[PDB]
């Protein structure tokens, strides 16, 4: 039980950190009426798939 719980905690923390890094990297692009740099769009998935 202890090992399983620690593994789940670690994987959840890593996933949360990836999501937070994505949000921090793609936060300034929603404050401008600009393009999303498809080079970055491919690597960093975002909610706008085709619009903007």
């Amino acid at each position: 039980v202890g090992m399983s719980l620690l593994a789940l905690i670690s994987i959840f923390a890593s996933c949360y950190m990836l999501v937070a890094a994505r949000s921090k990297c793609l936060t300034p692009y929603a404050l401008t009426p600009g393009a999303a740099v498809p080079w970055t769009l491919g690597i960093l998935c975002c909610a706008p798939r085709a619009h903007a």
Partner: protein, 161 residues
Amino acid sequence: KRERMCMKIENDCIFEVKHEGKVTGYACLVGDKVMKPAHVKGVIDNADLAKLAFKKSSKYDLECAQIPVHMRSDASKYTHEKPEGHYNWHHGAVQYSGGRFTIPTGAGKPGDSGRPIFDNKGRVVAIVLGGANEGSRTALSVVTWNKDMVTRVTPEGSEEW
């Protein structure tokens, strides 16, 4: 002539934010994105604009959301060029020298955050946050733009209006 056009654009593109019955800031429609400083708290005095989902970023102290389809034609147009000179404002004229926005009279008042600074052609350049009292003048802590990057300029001693 320029004043009348600027006031018309401000009437059609600026909305007051009501909080506890007192005005705290203004939300403007620039391009296709709703604008509002993050540190200013309240709700937009508009049924349609109140229900939008806002994307907060405390690094730049700005909250933005996609404007509804039917208010798109009633929104201002923007630019990213800042030549040296003077620019219009709802409280008079602002002096832009050396990458600094300065208030000639220091007439800024708390609760006036969210009023865009206009260009000579009626376009929006930056959104004000607060002012720093430098003697008789008052430098502006303002949220300006690059070609595609938001940059937050904050002079020393600025106070959030």
